[PDB]
Amino acid sequence: PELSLKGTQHIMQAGQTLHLQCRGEAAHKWSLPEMVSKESERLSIGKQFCSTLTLNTAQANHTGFYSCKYLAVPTSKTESAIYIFISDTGRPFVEMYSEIPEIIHMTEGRELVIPCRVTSPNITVTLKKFPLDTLIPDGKRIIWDSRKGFIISNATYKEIGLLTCEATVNGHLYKTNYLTHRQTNTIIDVQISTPRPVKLLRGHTLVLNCTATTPLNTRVQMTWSYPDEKNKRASVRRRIDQSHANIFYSVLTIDKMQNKDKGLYTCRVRSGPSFKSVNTSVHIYDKAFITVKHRKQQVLETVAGKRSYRLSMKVKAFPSPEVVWLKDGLPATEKSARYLTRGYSLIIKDVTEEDAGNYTILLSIKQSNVFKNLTATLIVNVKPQIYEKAVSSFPDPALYPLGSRQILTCTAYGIPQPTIKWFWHPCNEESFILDADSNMGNRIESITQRMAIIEGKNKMASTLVVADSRISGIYICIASNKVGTVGRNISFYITDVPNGFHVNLEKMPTEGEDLKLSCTVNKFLYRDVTWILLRTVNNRTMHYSISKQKMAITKEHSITLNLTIMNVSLQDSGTYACRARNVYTGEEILQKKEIT
Amino acid sequence: DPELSLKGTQHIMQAGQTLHLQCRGEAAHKWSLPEMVSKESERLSIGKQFCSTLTLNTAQANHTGFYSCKYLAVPTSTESAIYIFISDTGRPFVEMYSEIPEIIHMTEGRELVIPCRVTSPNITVTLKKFPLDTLIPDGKRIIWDSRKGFIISNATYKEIGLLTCEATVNGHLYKTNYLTHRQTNTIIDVQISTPRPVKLLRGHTLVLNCTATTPLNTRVQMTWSYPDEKNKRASVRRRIDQSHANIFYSVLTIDKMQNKDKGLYTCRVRSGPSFKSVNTSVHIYDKAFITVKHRKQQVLETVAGKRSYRLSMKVKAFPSPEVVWLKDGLPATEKSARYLTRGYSLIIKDVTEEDAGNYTILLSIKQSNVFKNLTATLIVNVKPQIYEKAVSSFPDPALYPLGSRQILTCTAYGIPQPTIKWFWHPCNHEESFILDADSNMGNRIESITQRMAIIEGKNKMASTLVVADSRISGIYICIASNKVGTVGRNISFYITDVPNGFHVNLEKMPTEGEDLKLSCTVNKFLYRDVTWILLRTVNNRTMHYSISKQKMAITKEHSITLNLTIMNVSLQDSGTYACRARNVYTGEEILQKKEIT
Amino acid sequence: EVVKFMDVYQRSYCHPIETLVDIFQEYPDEIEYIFKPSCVPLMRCGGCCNDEGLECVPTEESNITMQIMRIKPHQGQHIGEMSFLQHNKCECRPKK
Amino acid sequence: EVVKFMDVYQRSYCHPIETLVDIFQEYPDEIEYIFKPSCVPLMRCGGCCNDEGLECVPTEESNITMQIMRIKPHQGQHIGEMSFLQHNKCECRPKK
Numbered sequence A: 001p002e003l004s005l006k007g008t009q010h011i012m013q014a015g016q017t018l019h020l021q022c023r024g025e026a027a028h029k030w031s032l033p034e035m036v037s038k039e040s041e042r043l044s045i046g047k048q049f050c051s052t053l054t055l056n057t058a059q060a061n062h063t064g065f066y067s068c069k070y071l072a073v074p075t076s077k078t079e080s081a082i083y084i085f086i087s088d089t090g091r092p093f094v095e096m097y098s099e100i101p102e103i104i105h106m107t108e109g110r111e112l113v114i115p116c117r118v119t120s121p122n123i124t125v126t127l128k129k130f131p132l133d134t135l136i137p138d139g140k141r142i143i144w145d146s147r148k149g150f151i152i153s154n155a156t157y158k159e160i161g162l163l164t165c166e167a168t169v170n171g172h173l174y175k176t177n178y179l180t181h182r183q184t185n186t187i188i189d190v191q192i193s194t195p196r197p198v199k200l201l202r203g204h205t206l207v208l209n210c211t212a213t214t215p216l217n218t219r220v221q222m223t224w225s226y227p228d229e230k231n232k233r234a235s236v237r238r239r240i241d242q243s244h245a246n247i248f249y250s251v252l253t254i255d256k257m258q259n260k261d262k263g264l265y266t267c268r269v270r271s272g273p274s275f276k277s278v279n280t281s282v283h284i285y286d287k288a289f290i291t292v293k294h295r296k297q298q299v300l301e302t303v304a305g306k307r308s309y310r311l312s313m314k315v316k317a318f319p320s321p322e323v324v325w326l327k328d329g330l331p332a333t334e335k336s337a338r339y340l341t342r343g344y345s346l347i348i349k350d351v352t353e354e355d356a357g358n359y360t361i362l363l364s365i366k367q368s369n370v371f372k373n374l375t376a377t378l379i380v381n382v383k384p385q386i387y388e389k390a391v392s393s394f395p396d397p398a399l400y401p402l403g404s405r406q407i408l409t410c411t412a413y414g415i416p417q418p419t420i421k422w423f424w425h426p427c428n429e430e431s432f433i434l435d436a437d438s439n440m441g442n443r444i445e446s447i448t449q450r451m452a453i454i455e456g457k458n459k460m461a462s463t464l465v466v467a468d469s470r471i472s473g474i475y476i477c478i479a480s481n482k483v484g485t486v487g488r489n490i491s492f493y494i495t496d497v498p499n500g501f502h503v504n505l506e507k508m509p510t511e512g513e514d515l516k517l518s519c520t521v522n523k524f525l526y527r528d529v530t531w532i533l534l535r536t537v538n539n540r541t542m543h544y545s546i547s548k549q550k551m552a553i554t555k556e557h558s559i560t561l562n563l564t565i566m567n568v569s570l571q572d573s574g575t576y577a578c579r580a581r582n583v584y585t586g587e588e589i590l591q592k593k594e595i596t
Numbered sequence B: 001d002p003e004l005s006l007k008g009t010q011h012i013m014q015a016g017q018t019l020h021l022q023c024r025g026e027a028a029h030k031w032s033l034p035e036m037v038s039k040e041s042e043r044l045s046i047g048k049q050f051c052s053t054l055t056l057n058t059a060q061a062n063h064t065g066f067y068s069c070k071y072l073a074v075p076t077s078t079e080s081a082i083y084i085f086i087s088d089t090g091r092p093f094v095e096m097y098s099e100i101p102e103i104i105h106m107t108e109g110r111e112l113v114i115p116c117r118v119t120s121p122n123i124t125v126t127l128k129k130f131p132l133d134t135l136i137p138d139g140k141r142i143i144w145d146s147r148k149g150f151i152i153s154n155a156t157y158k159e160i161g162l163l164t165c166e167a168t169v170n171g172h173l174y175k176t177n178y179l180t181h182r183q184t185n186t187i188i189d190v191q192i193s194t195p196r197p198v199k200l201l202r203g204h205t206l207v208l209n210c211t212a213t214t215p216l217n218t219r220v221q222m223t224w225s226y227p228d229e230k231n232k233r234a235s236v237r238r239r240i241d242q243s244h245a246n247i248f249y250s251v252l253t254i255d256k257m258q259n260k261d262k263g264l265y266t267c268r269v270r271s272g273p274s275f276k277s278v279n280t281s282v283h284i285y286d287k288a289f290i291t292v293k294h295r296k297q298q299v300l301e302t303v304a305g306k307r308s309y310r311l312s313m314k315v316k317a318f319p320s321p322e323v324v325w326l327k328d329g330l331p332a333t334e335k336s337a338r339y340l341t342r343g344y345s346l347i348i349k350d351v352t353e354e355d356a357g358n359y360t361i362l363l364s365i366k367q368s369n370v371f372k373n374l375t376a377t378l379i380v381n382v383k384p385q386i387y388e389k390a391v392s393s394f395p396d397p398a399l400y401p402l403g404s405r406q407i408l409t410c411t412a413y414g415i416p417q418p419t420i421k422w423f424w425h426p427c428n429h430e431e432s433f434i435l436d437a438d439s440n441m442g443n444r445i446e447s448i449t450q451r452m453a454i455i456e457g458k459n460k461m462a463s464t465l466v467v468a469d470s471r472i473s474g475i476y477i478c479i480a481s482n483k484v485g486t487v488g489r490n491i492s493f494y495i496t497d498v499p500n501g502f503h504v505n506l507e508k509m510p511t512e513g514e515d516l517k518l519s520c521t522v523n524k525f526l527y528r529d530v531t532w533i534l535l536r537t538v539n540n541r542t543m544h545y546s547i548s549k550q551k552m553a554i555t556k557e558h559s560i561t562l563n564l565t566i567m568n569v570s571l572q573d574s575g576t577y578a579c580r581a582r583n584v585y586t587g588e589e590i591l592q593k594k595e596i597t
Numbered sequence C, D: 001e002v003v004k005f006m007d008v009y010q011r012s013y014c015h016p017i018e019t020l021v022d023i024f025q026e027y028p029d030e031i032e033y034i035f036k037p038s039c040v041p042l043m044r045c046g047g048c049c050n051d052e053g054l055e056c057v058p059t060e061e062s063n064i065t066m067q068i069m070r071i072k073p074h075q076g077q078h079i080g081e082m083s084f085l086q087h088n089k090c091e092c093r094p095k096k
């Protein structure tokens, strides 16, 4: 793209005409600094293409980069350029800002360009900073260009302010003013206080707070999106943290609130490119709101010994109520000192059978005198416990005479009232027993239970009556309700001889007769049965012996050891005893003295 | 009484002249002067009438004012006075304040007198209020007096500032300036924060506050009184609530604290008339203070069932420690959920025998790694309880066969280890102990022995009372009692002379036409209203009979007897006979018998 | 070299003096604009009354119009005439 | 009738302007005296840099001695020469 006016520079005065050509082959695009309207004209025509551009009159506001672009071809992905200057005896500046300076959005630390370009390239321009500063171009960090302006490398803080370019032409001083404006636009975050769905009365006042955060040299523009029409007022303000931080408040107020005012309210913080919007809801119209339901009231059935029990109930209310918990009625409040409140709940520490009763709960909303009491009954299970287990009955594992009537008893208590059942266990395996059972163990007379109120508790005591003790068993009484079970083993050994450990005595007439002794030892206690002779003189005793190899007649029930001596003289007579050990215990021995 | 030379109230005089005044009376005269210069002027004083005179050398405008001869120089004792006007062609003000104005302490609502008095009574003086204002005397609120100045009744707020009196003499303008200054001096109260006996470390920094409260237009002067010599600095400052109030601050600071600095510190706020002094004490020298003792540790012996028991221990510590309580060791901390804390105390709500143990407490003062533990032992008494009472023994109103060895047991447990003892009580139609020979006799007592059996987890103690020969009806009461409580149980010990209490002696009949002798034996006092029944039934009709037409009823202790005899028993006089015996303990007990001839 | 006492008292007594009021303090509702200059010189009551019970309040006020540059964030900036309050005469009155 | 923008800007930029300083702010240690006048006119740094990040700080200062009246409660009154700081030149600098 060849141009008519050969070169990059051109001289021209005011009132003249421009004449530029651009001969080529394809169409050319014209680049101009200032594009007015309906002032000048242009056209374009083997056969060589030629483009041109004319101009009528001449003004200083049409001076700058003029270029013929040969880029108007998609396949051509060479351009000419030339500077055109229009001088004048009046204003030597293209951009005249004398009264009001022009605003220059800049940024600290980066490049800054001052666009106070002149018309003549020989005019000496001076750049000054308000009020007593003058920047001197050095050709490196600050470079002066009569076609472009002032180029500043790394714009520090000492360039944010009012700058002015001055030039003297024919003894007349002219000046244009510029204003560098450091400004960002970083809408950091927004937040509505409080983000909770607000509840109010039909006729109360709605108050909403929206807070914005931005750095320095930046503003926002806050607005509220409400569903209804023009309600009331809405004030906005600003606060500086002076670091680098700006805070923006926005207060929305609706003095007259009605049922229609219920809806969504959105705070919109717009500042051009970046945009933020946080939303929150508002409910209304409630007059006096108290509604209390629960979980499974009022059949709360807990068990004794429970650790960290908890009751609960759901409460729909407005506004915040005063909740006080009660027990069996009545005040209560925290009468038992244990337990705990908090959370519309009633957490029990450790549960005992005395914790039963109709737990009341009174929810008091003051400022309107709206109270609502609620009953909640609690029943504590106790589980069974057989009281006869605790009493230590000393009479060693009980042995009963053969063919004797015996009677047993087991007492237990709990909530609900537990049930008892007996069993059997022989000794050479359990058996439910009734008034015709169980072929037969021992002859059962009667099994009957009663409801006795002893030790302040309504206990239950059953009694199994053995009509005829015959076989050695182990009666088990088992008490159990629906929350636990417990049994007690009734040691029922049996004997055939009086009180166990009997000595059958068949003495002798006189000297030379026979002796027949029989020692009966109950079932399988008192192991190691034997006999003993003894006679004492002065301070000495000692026993004797045995054994005559008469081992060993065992019998259920009660074993035997018969000692027989044939033809007793005067010295073969003295004191005879039956010495037997024992299990658990605790040795026993039964004596007998006779001399012939 | 005092006669004066220059008769009248006014006088005219010029500069450079002299004063010649007389005062003739009987006693001495006191001369009242507006301004006694010094050794400048002179005075002397001489039937015979006492005469007193007064002279003056030269004349100066400073001596305009009240010249009075007071005749009050007598304790048993009228006064004459006159104004001397000494003028001068510049300057005609007595007291001229050109550069520095004179301060006039005043009060809003009261009287204000501006002391700009002139020499000539015909001098015209203008009063001006800065900035640009002029007060015109009217004779009531603002009164002009060339002898004293400007008199202002009811001084409002507009009179607080710089006042200027101006006068023009010989084409020249002169002016004197006065500065009205409202001021009070009411030290309301002072307070040192905090008034507690401050404690600090040997080497810490002491900082003390002292606040002073005064109304508007007043200052104070605050100081600190410490026992040692010059230590460190002490800054001060003033703050205004704007209502109307002033607050003054005094901050004493000693960066290097030593043992000698311990003493008394008094903030002394002075302002002239009013004075206040608030003081406080300071202790120091301590380095890392943790010292814990108690009251009766560690023999704490509460009793079970106690509601709200409270341990404690004295803690002398500095600074504030973090206290954590422990039980049987170990963490603990509040493992049992209950047992509250706070107040360096250990409060148990409901005490049980599982609460015993050596309660340890850990007191932790951080920032120096200084901890101190302490052990205190708790023992809980349980009180006795007989377990035979808990069991519901159905059988029975207990009776026993005559001449039988019976064994009676009582099992009880408590802390301390309880004691059991048996007594006696008959019935017939204040107690004594029983042992191995006692007690003539109740019943033939054999062996009473107790033993230590470990049942149900507790080391319980059970006694057994063994009767060798039950002969008389009594009630053996076993009683268990330690030092914290007692519990007794009476064991009903009846006695029967007949099998199981109820008996029917059966003496039957050979054949028809014979006799019948029936005998019903009932125990002492457990079945009453004894009778005889006969049955026999044809289908669904049955019912009872009778009785009771004799023969009487013989009550023989123990256990009564009922003899029924029938003569000539036929085929219809024999069926099913029974002995019915009512009772009040539990109703009904009938024993039947069938025989037919 | 040392300023006299009477000069200090008169130059500091309650009188209208030129003060540089921040514009945002007079108009906190237009937070969507950056103004230049951010402050404007205004004749406001300054000085002390030398009495803690008196306050330098205005007794005669007026209104003045100034050209302030209004800068909207990234969306154009125009020059506007904003009005401010000034004090012609000041007096010492009791507070509250 | 309307104030020009160039005058409003230059009269509001960071420059030393006469400000009425309260003496108690300059000397908070002397709390036992009542100063008259309680405020003094001093040349201090006033104005705005028109940039929230910059601040109007002084670069050249000096002190000036004035005669202030000191009024101790009920204990006499005297005139004293006191010192007061002034700002000769101000400039815009970053705060951090």
Ligand SMILES: *[C@@H]1O[C@H](CO)[C@@H](O[C@@H]2O[C@H](CO)[C@@H](O)[C@H](O)[C@H]2NC(C)=O)[C@H](O)[C@H]1NC(C)=O
Residues within 6 Å of the ligand: A036, A039, A059, A060, A061, A062
């Ligand atoms: C360049 O500046 C000239 C100054 O002469 C302006 O031209 C004037 O524009 C106004 C705007 O409507 C017209 O009313 C005038 O008639 C125009 N001419 C004159 C002599 O004032 C305009 O700003 C620019 N004109 C061109 C062609 O660039």
Ligand SMILES: *[C@@H]1O[C@H](CO)[C@@H](O[C@@H]2O[C@H](CO)[C@@H](O)[C@H](O)[C@H]2NC(C)=O)[C@H](O)[C@H]1NC(C)=O
Residues within 6 Å of the ligand: B109, B154, B156
């Ligand atoms: C002192 O101040 C004034 C002057 O008398 C009293 O308040 C009122 O002032 C107006 C004019 O300033 C008078 O017209 C009223 O008559 C005044 N009221 C009364 C009740 O006098 C004020 O009361 C005076 N107080 C004293 C104690 O003298």
Ligand SMILES: *[C@@H]1O[C@H](CO)[C@@H](O)[C@H](O)[C@H]1NC(C)=O
Residues within 6 Å of the ligand: A109, A154, A155, A156
């Ligand atoms: C720009 O400002 C000064 C120029 O010397 C310098 O302190 C600063 O570091 C420069 N910035 C960068 C990114 O170099």
Ligand SMILES: *[C@@H]1O[C@H](CO)[C@@H](O)[C@H](O)[C@H]1NC(C)=O
Residues within 6 Å of the ligand: A193, A194, A207, A208, A209, A251
């Ligand atoms: C909203 O902000 C204003 C500003 O002072 C405050 O008074 C008000 O209490 C705030 N409201 C809420 C609900 O935080």
Ligand SMILES: *[C@@H]1O[C@H](CO)[C@@H](O)[C@H](O)[C@H]1NC(C)=O
Residues within 6 Å of the ligand: A264, A279
């Ligand atoms: C409300 O805020 C939520 C937050 O994620 C958003 O998803 C929603 O679009 C907003 N607007 C509504 C619910 O109208």
Ligand SMILES: *[C@@H]1O[C@H](CO)[C@@H](O)[C@H](O)[C@H]1NC(C)=O
Residues within 6 Å of the ligand: A328, A329, A330, A358
């Ligand atoms: C709980 O129930 C009892 C049962 O008799 C009854 O008196 C009352 O209605 C309730 N409230 C109490 C006792 O406070």
Ligand SMILES: *[C@@H]1O[C@H](CO)[C@@H](O)[C@H](O)[C@H]1NC(C)=O
Residues within 6 Å of the ligand: A371, A372, A373
């Ligand atoms: C419940 O509360 C209401 C309060 O209005 C009142 O009747 C009384 O206090 C309570 N009534 C009953 C029956 O508990």
Ligand SMILES: *[C@@H]1O[C@H](CO)[C@@H](O)[C@H](O)[C@H]1NC(C)=O
Residues within 6 Å of the ligand: A425, A476, A489
């Ligand atoms: C009771 O006897 C049965 C019989 O085998 C035994 O299994 C059970 O463990 C006994 N009870 C106790 C508590 O030991």
Ligand SMILES: *[C@@H]1O[C@H](CO)[C@@H](O)[C@H](O)[C@H]1NC(C)=O
Residues within 6 Å of the ligand: A512, A513, A514, A566, A567
């Ligand atoms: C024991 O004595 C009797 C007495 O007559 C005698 O008959 C008998 O033979 C003797 N010997 C034995 C072993 O019985």
Ligand SMILES: *[C@@H]1O[C@H](CO)[C@@H](O)[C@H](O)[C@H]1NC(C)=O
Residues within 6 Å of the ligand: B037, B060, B061, B062, B091
């Ligand atoms: C006042 O001052 C002294 C005496 O107090 C004297 O020297 C002087 O002349 C008097 N008069 C004047 C006008 O100073």
Ligand SMILES: *[C@@H]1O[C@H](CO)[C@@H](O)[C@H](O)[C@H]1NC(C)=O
Residues within 6 Å of the ligand: B121, B122
């Ligand atoms: C001052 O004024 C009084 C008022 O009547 C007058 O009698 C007197 O002559 C006057 N004096 C002079 C010196 O003018």
Ligand SMILES: *[C@@H]1O[C@H](CO)[C@@H](O)[C@H](O)[C@H]1NC(C)=O
Residues within 6 Å of the ligand: B193, B209, B249
């Ligand atoms: C002392 O008073 C000052 C002034 O109010 C206060 O800032 C400071 O916290 C106070 N010090 C104490 C220890 O109370």
Ligand SMILES: *[C@@H]1O[C@H](CO)[C@@H](O)[C@H](O)[C@H]1NC(C)=O
Residues within 6 Å of the ligand: B278, B279, B280
């Ligand atoms: C310190 O203050 C107390 C509290 O009023 C007061 O009793 C005491 O007299 C004062 N002076 C001294 C030296 O304790």
Ligand SMILES: *[C@@H]1O[C@H](CO)[C@@H](O)[C@H](O)[C@H]1NC(C)=O
Residues within 6 Å of the ligand: B298, B328, B329, B357, B358, B360, B375, B377
């Ligand atoms: C437990 O308490 C006893 C009672 O004096 C004490 O001797 C012992 O050291 C304590 N042991 C622990 C581990 O606390």
Ligand SMILES: *[C@@H]1O[C@H](CO)[C@@H](O)[C@H](O)[C@H]1NC(C)=O
Residues within 6 Å of the ligand: B372, B373
């Ligand atoms: C206190 O307890 C801690 C940790 O249990 C232990 O390290 C320390 O030695 C104990 N101190 C004393 C004095 O027992």
Ligand SMILES: *[C@@H]1O[C@H](CO)[C@@H](O)[C@H](O)[C@H]1NC(C)=O
Residues within 6 Å of the ligand: B490
């Ligand atoms: C005997 O037992 C009965 C139980 O009914 C009791 O009332 C009575 O007090 C007891 N006797 C004595 C002396 O305690």
